Write a structure and sequence with these properties.
The chain is an all-alpha fold and 572 residues long. Interacts with FCGRT; this interaction regulates ALB homeostasis. Interacts with TASOR. In plasma, occurs in a covalently-linked complex with chromophore-bound alpha-1-microglobulin; this interaction does not prevent fatty acid binding to ALB.
C-alpha cells in the first residue's frame, strides 16, 4: 500500500499537515471547514491502511484517491470539468491560480490572537497553513511545515511576553517576509521544471550546489542534483507526500555522508527533520580546497577538447560548470550558466571550423564582456538605491519599466516594481563580494513572477519574447529592452483617477501603492513628455490628498476637487 508507506514514513501529524496543504493548494476558494473534514477523512482511511495493508482501496494510487475525494463536493462549481475525467491530475494542476483574488490577510488584535492560539493551536496552525498555501499554490510542501513551526514559536514567545502586540507585529512581519521569499524562489523552480526541463533545472542546481559545497566530488553533486530534481519534480507535479518523504530521505543521506560533501553540516544534522532540511537548505558557503589548478589548462589549452566533448557533451559541460562555479561564489548562478552556454556554442562552432585549438584558445575574450554588464548594473542600481531610498527606487523603476512595457496591467507593473525595489534593501546592504549573486538571482526570481503573471493573459509581444526564450537570459533580456512605440497613449478616462475618501483611513503601504498606481496611469497616458512634469504632478497628488483628507469634510472636497485635477493633470 502507498498510503501506509507514506504514513509510516511521515507520521500522523505531518501527514495531516501535508494533506491539508494539498487540498489548500488545489482548492484555494473553498472555505476552511470543508478542508478540515476532508483531511480528517483522509487520515481516518490512512490509519485503516496501516492496520491492514491489503484493505480495499489501499492498493490504489494517491492521485486517484485524492481526486475521488475531491469530486464529492467539488462537483459544485470550472472544477466540475476535471471531475468528468480520470488527465484529471494535470487538469487540477492546470486550474491552479497564480494570482487569486484573495485579500492580503486580515489580522485581529494581540489578545484575541493569543486567545485563539492558546484555545486550540491545532486549528490555529492549520488555519495559518490554509491561509498561506491558498494564496501561494506553488509553495514547497515541507518548507511550509517548518515555517509553520516558526509561527508556533512566534506565538509561544509573544503570548508570554510583556506587551503581546508590540512583541507580535514585527515578528509577524518577519515570518511574512521570509515566507514570501521562499514562495517566490520556489515558483521559479516549478517554472524551470514544468517549462524548461530537468536539463535546465539540473544545470541551475549544479551551479548553486557547486557554489555552496566546493569540496565535494562532481559525481556526488551529480547524483545529488539528480535526486533534488526528482523531489522538486514531485513537488511541482502535486506529488506532495512523496516529495516530503524524498526530502527527508535526502537529508538523511546527506547526514550519512558529511565527509563527502562539506564541513558546515555538523550542527545542522543534530536537529529535527524539518529544522534539518531548512538548516541544510540554507547553510553558508564552504571553504575551497587547495589542490586546484587553472581552468585554462583543462578547458582551453588542453588537447582533448573536441574529442572529449564529442564523447559525452552533457557530462563534459556539467564538469565545466562544476569547476567554474566551485571557484566563484561571487558570481550569480545566471552569470555562470550564461558563460556555460557561451562555452557550449564555442565548442560547437570551433571543432568544425579551420583549426579547433587555435580558435577555441580565445574563449576568455568572449568571457570578458559577459561578466562586465552585470556588475555595471549592480553598481549603477545600488548607486540609485542609495541616492533615492527604497520608495524613490520603486518609483524610478516604475518609470523605467512602464516605459519598457506600457501594455502591462497596472497591478502587475506596480507589484513587480516594488519587489524590484526590495533588491536594494536586501542585497546592496551586503559587501560587494556578495552583491552580484544576491542581486541577479533575486532579479531572475522577480522577473519569473512577472512572466508567470503575464502568462495568464498575454498583452505585450516583447514581454512574451523575453519570457519565452531562455531562462538564464531573462534578466539580460529585460535590460536590453527600452522604450516602446507600438503602444498608443491612453486617454484620461472617467475612472483613471477619481478615487474615494476612505483613502485617508488606509495605511501608508497601500497609500503608496495607490500613489504608484496613479503614477502608472500617468506614465501610460503620455509616455513622451515625461521630464520633471511627472514629479510635478505626483507632488500635487500628495498635496491634494493630504489637504483634502485633513479637512474632515463628509466626502465633499474629494468629489469636488476630483474632477478638477484630472484636467489640471492633463494640461501638464
Amino acid at each position: 500500500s502507498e498510503i501506509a508507506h507514506r504514513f509510516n514514513d511521515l507520521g500522523e501529524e505531518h501527514f495531516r499537515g501535508l494533506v491539508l496543504v494539498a487540498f489548500s493548494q488545489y482548492l484555494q476558494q473553498c472555505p476552511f471547514e470543508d478542508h478540515v473534514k476532508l483531511v480528517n477523512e483522509v487520515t481516518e482511511f490512512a490509519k485503516g491502511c496501516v492496520a491492514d495493508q491489503s484493505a480495499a482501496n489501499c492498493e490504489k494510487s494517491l492521485h486517484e484517491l485524492l481526486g475521488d475525494k475531491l469530486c464529492t463536493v467539488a462537483s459544485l462549481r470550472e472544477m466540475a470539468d476535471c471531475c468528468e475525467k480520470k488527465e484529471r491530475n494535470e487538469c487540477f494542476l492546470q486550474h491552479k491560480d497564480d494570482n487569486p483574488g484573495f485579500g492580503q490577510l486580515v489580522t485581529p488584535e494581540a489578545d484575541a490572537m493569543c486567545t485563539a492560539f492558546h484555545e486550540n493551536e491545532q486549528r490555529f496552525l492549520g488555519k495559518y497553513l490554509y491561509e498561506i498555501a491558498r494564496r501561494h499554490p506553488y509553495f514547497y510542501a515541507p518548507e511550509l511545515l517548518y515555517y509553520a513551526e516558526e509561527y508556533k514559536g512566534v506565538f509561544t514567545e509573544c503570548c508570554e511576553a510583556a506587551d503581546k502586540a508590540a512583541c507580535l507585529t514585527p515578528k509577524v512581519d518577519a515570518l511574512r517576509e521570509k515566507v514570501l521569499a521562499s514562495s517566490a524562489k520556489e515558483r521559479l523552480k516549478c517554472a524551470s521544471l514544468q517549462k524548461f526541463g530537468e536539463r535546465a533545472f539540473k544545470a541551475w542546481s549544479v551551479a548553486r550546489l557547486s557554489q555552496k559545497f566546493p569540496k565535494a566530488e562532481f559525481a556526488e553533486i551529480s547524483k545529488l542534483v539528480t535526486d533534488l530534481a526528482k523531489i522538486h519534480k514531485e513537488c511541482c507535479h502535486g506529488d506532495l507526500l512523496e516529495c516530503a518523504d524524498d526530502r527527508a530521505d535526502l537529508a538523511k543521506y546527506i547526514c550519512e555522508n558529511q565527509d563527502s560533501i562539506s564541513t558546515k553540516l555538523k550542527e545542522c544534522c543534530g536537529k529535527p527533520v524539518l529544522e534539518k532540511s531548512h538548516c541544510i537548505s540554507e547553510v553558508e558557503r564552504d571553504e575551497l580546497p587547495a589542490d586546484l589548478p587553472p581552468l585554462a589548462v583543462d578547458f582551453v589549452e588542453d588537447k582533448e577538447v573536441c574529442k572529449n566533448y564529442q564523447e559525452a557533451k552533457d557530462v563534459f559541460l556539467g564538469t565545466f560548470l562544476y569547476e567554474y562555479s566551485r571557484r566563484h561564489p561571487e558570481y550569480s548562478v545566471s552569470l555562470l550558466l550564461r558563460l556555460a552556454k557561451e562555452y557550449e556554442a564555442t565548442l560547437e562552432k570551433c571543432c568544425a571550423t579551420d583549426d579547433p585549438p587555435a580558435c577555441y584558445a580565445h574563449v576568455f575574450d568572449e568571457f570578458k564582456p559577459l561578466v562586465e554588464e552585470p556588475h555595471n548594473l549592480v553598481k549603477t542600481n545600488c548607486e540609485l538605491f542609495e541616492k533615492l531610498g527604497e520608495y524613490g527606487f520603486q518609483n524610478a523603476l516604475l518609470v523605467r519599466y512602464t516605459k519598457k512595457v506600457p501594455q502591462v496591467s497596472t497591478p502587475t507593473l506596480v507589484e513587480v516594481s516594488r519587489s524590484l525595489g526590495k533588491v536594494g534593501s536586501k542585497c546592496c546592504t551586503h559587501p560587494e563580494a556578495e552583491r552580484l549573486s544576491c542581486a541577479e538571482d533575486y532579479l531572475s526570481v522577480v522577473l519569473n513572477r512577472l512572466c508567470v503573471l503575464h502568462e495568464k493573459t498575454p498583452v505585450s509581444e516583447r514581454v512574451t519574447k523575453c519570457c519565452t526564450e531562455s531562462l538564464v537570459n531573462r534578466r539580460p533580456c529585460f535590460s536590453a529592452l527600452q522604450v516602446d512605440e507600438t503602444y498608443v497613449p491612453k486617454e484620461f478616462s472617467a475612472e483613471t483617477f477619481t478615487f474615494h475618501a476612505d483613502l485617508c483611513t488606509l495605511p501608508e503601504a497601500e497609500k503608496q501603492i495607490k500613489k504608484q498606481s496613479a503614477l502608472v496611469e500617468l506614465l501610460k497616458h503620455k509616455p513622451k513628455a515625461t521630464e520633471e512634469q511627472l514629479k510635478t504632478v505626483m507632488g500635487d497628488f500628495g498635496s491634494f490628498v493630504d489637504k483634502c483628507c485633513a479637512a474632515e469634510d463628509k466626502e465633499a472636497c474629494f468629489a469636488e476637487e476630483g474632477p478638477k485635477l484630472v484636467a489640471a493633470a492633463q494640461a501638464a
